[PDB]
Design a protein around this nucleic acid. Structure first.
Lengths: 97, 103, 95, 73, 78, 97, 83, 105, 93
DNA sequence: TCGGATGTATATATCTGACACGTGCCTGGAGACTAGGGAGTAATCCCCTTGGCGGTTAAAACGCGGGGGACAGCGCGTACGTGCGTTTAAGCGGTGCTAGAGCTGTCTACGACCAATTGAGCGGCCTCGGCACCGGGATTCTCGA
DNA sequence: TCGAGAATCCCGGTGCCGAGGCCGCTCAATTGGTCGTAGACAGCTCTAGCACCGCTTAAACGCACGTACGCGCTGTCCCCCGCGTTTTAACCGCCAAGGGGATTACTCCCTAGTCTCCAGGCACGTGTCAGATATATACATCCGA
């Protein structure tokens, strides 16, 4: 059969709110971190635990930002998030100039 | 010793040494470490009691960081205290906005 | 073979005193270590700042009490103050 | 004999009918008093669907019954 | 390289927050935001290890850089 | 009898008040409010004038910033008039309680 | 001596002027009361700190410099009164 | 000469900074080159702020600097706004800005 | 009794930069507070880093890194250039 | 689309009180010398990071049908902006007074330093049952009727 | 509402590794004692915060009136969402090599500490001119035609 749009989303929401594991694959994140840090100094070595800590911090920050974006989106009588909501949330937070 | 004279669990000599070597003041009193140790023990006892209760609810005998996260976030004073700190492998409180729910 | 000291044993003692039959994982122990260190550093820094602000070179129990009253919210502040004064009175009673 | 009908908007409709009232007849009654074209209505009584050629009593429909309708589009 | 942050990973990350109907270029927006955040924290950590006179970035540098920005992290000995 | 269209005098006042620099709230009501608030914590307190002046300056700055953020939220919500829900949304996003 | 009903001292036109400084054009009917709450909470924090400082100095007069300290604690440093 | 400030060709006092660093309880032992570095940094920052404020006052044909000029100079420079994002100054005021769609058509 | 301030030095810098301008007392207090705050921030961060690296003394390198951490890029490099110039000028004679 | 009316930017005298500057004197900063402990430097270990190969399988990528959501046009009635007369309390200005902040002397109990000592806390080893994983059935929603 | 199809939770068995405990050891906490000074206490003086009253007028309050904006209704078009098929690279397991993080021993020179001398900066005092106040005029702009 077929499910109506909006049910699998709720099931995924429950499943991911219940669990506690990371969602971004380790290898691409490590490659991105090394590439970003390449500019500031050449031939740098990274311990695994530092990459793990950076991963956790990024996950937490992104989750909080998406929370605020969802709040703004439901505020303007909508259900879908669009970039202007991210811009508004970041501006009010005091991060962006 | 000195912890026994006050009926404390946390060390007093360690706190005294850390205060003296922590370049906070030229001289330190003889009563401050006892007070600080008592405060620390009270706080950790509260946190541990809450975490143990949360783990008891889930029918497990060992505390994992998610239990600490739940215990901290459920209480409101403790949440106010730890307002700007993230816990590794913690999770998120399970809430859903009212509008998103189907009719 | 560096002698890295920590707070594991005392936290375990407190946990056993409060809950008899309960165990704890290593990650939780590290979490508690970090939390205790952070709270200690906050209280000590605030007390030292106040003592230097009042142009006095000795840090006593009153400074600690005032710092505790400043940092923690109402209920926890009053409970911690009561526990601290009880402990100080018990310590000074004996010798 | 009178029946109550439950819609999707929470409004109950009271209609006088008889056991000989075929599904054609009752559907015509709903269309007349509510303006709903007949092709948009599905009826469920006692958890069963019905064929238009039958009559009311064929489903053991008694008085004071509660019949649910579904709008199909 | 920055493309390596896959779209379904972003979808899962947003689903943890509790969004229902994702649409648009929020993928690109999120990639940019993540790049900026990583740039800042990596710069701080690199400065710390530069002063330390070492060649391997350790966990303490990252923990301390996060501490500077008022984003203290628990669970790595810091 | 000339009558200016709505919103013109408002804009003129907007420019006038952003041009100047002096404080807005009067003195005696603020002083009485401060004394009444401070009465509860401890009885028989005496205040220095500069303390009340500093409290007033800080309060005015905070209120102006909050109103600016509220206006930003309102203009985002496709409206022109601000409403209390905008105020509480701004307070929630800022991280206050 | 007891004091009462001072919150109403913040007049409506003064609040309108404060809003006009920030860049607002139109004002709803029900906003004013709401604002009269929020400001209160603000004060109820900072004074609570300042008095405590005067407690530690063993004095009876609240000094502006203590208010500067209290404002500094909340991360809203203010310039113009020393320290 | 005699003073240490003239040795480095600076205006800010070196001995005062050294004494404050020693008595501020920051470290058990303080170096000998730190006060010069700190004084140079302070002098540079003060010079930048004063130059910007003087230009702002010049634009308003007034020969004396009031706090409004300092506020305008600080808030009109992006980096200087960044450094003091959590600091308010008395009598400063606000920048004269208005939203776009708020203006009349 | 005596009340230390930063009057003569700020006035001298103003005279050096703009020869024919004057300032009022409130601006003086504002500048004094700003200088004190910057001093406190830099000194505290440098001491914290020095004890962080388990070192028992504070030297010019610690302040250089503190300035690099605090001030954003362009004026940070300007300030470190000024500091190095001052240090070499002082140690030369 | 103009034209009368209104608010505003500018030109001008003037008087005052806040700003720039001279003086004397007091205390913190500069000069010469000591000594000892912290930091730079050299050599060595071995531990953790980098690098690569094979495979498998789970997740990623791509294409299609459709329905529910975002957005624009239109009507309405109600709440807020503007103007005016009346009422009211803020603000300026001299006077009294004392409670309380700030500086000075004293002497005293409390904390830093130090030699001897011993046991509390940390590194290393080993052992098992609470938790991770897998197979199975009852339960509970969810879409087409 | 309602009935069948999946999706999910509860139940039972099996195995394995991280936690709890035990043992041996070393350096930091305790004990006893001396010596110096930070601060509590008592006192004295002088200022500014409180209370007071009168007069003025600019500011707040209440009321009419009108019109523009928040809100609900409706229609259209299209953009993600659920699902099935093909493609790919992440991860686990394993093995080799070696750079540099961490210790240990040795040597030197840089800063705290001491005293003596004296000049830079502080409070005090005073003169004067830049800006606020008040007045008068030309320019820009706004709402009815």
């Amino acid at each position: 059969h077929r499910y109506r749009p909006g049910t699998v989303a709720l099931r995924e929401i429950r499943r991911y709110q219940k669990s506690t594991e990371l969602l971004i694959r380790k290898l691409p994140f490590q490659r991105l971190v090394r590439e970003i840090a390449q500019d500031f100094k050449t031939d740098l070595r990274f311990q695994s635990s530092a990459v793990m800590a950076l991963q956790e911090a990024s996950e937490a920050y992104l989750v909080a930002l998406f929370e605020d974006t969802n709040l703004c989106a439901i505020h303007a009588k909508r259900v879908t998030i669009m970039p202007k909501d991210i811009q508004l949330a970041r501006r009010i937070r005091g991060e962006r100039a | 010793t000195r912890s026994s004279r006050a009926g404390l669990q946390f060390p007093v000599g360690r706190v005294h040494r850390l205060l003296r070597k922590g370049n906070y003041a030229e001289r330190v009193g003889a009563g401050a470490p006892v007070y600080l140790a008592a405060v620390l023990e009270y706080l950790t006892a509260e946190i541990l009691e809450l975490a143990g209760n949360a783990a008891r609810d889930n029918k497990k005998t060992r505390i994992i960081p998610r239990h600490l996260q739940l215990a901290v976030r459920n209480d409101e004073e403790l949440n106010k205290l730890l307002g700007r700190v993230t816990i590794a492998q913690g999770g998120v409180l399970p809430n859903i906005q009212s509008v998103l729910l189907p009719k | 073979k560096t002698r890295k000291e920590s707070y594991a044993i005392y936290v375990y003692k407190v946990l056993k005193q409060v809950h008899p039959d309960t165990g704890i994982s290593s990650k939780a122990m590290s979490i508690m270590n970090s939390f205790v260190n952070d709270v200690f550093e906050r209280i000590a820094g605030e007390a030292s700042r106040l003592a230097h602000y009042n142009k006095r070179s000795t840090i006593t129990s009153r400074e600690i009490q005032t710092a505790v009253r400043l940092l923690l919210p109402g209920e926890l502040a009053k409970h911690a103050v009561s526990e601290g004064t009880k402990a100080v009175t018990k310590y000074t009673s004996a010798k | 004999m009178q029946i109550f009908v439950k819609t999707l908007t929470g409004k109950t409709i009271t209609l006088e009918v008889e056991p000989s009232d075929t599904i054609e007849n009752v559907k015509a009654k709903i269309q007349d008093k509510e303006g709903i074209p007949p092709d948009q209505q599905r009826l469920i009584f006692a958890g069963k669907q019905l064929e238009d050629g039958r009559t009311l009593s064929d489903y053991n429909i008694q008085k004071e019954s509660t019949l649910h309708l579904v709008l199909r589009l | 390289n920055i493309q390596g942050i896959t779209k379904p990973a972003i979808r899962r990350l947003a689903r943890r927050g509790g969004v229902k109907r994702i649409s648009g270029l929020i993928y690109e927006e999120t990639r940019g935001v993540l790049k900026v955040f990583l740039e800042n924290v990596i710069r701080d950590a690199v400065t710390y290890t530069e002063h330390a006179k070492r060649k391997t970035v350790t966990a303490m540098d990252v923990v301390y850089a996060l501490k500077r920005q008022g984003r203290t992290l628990y669970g790595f000995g810091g």
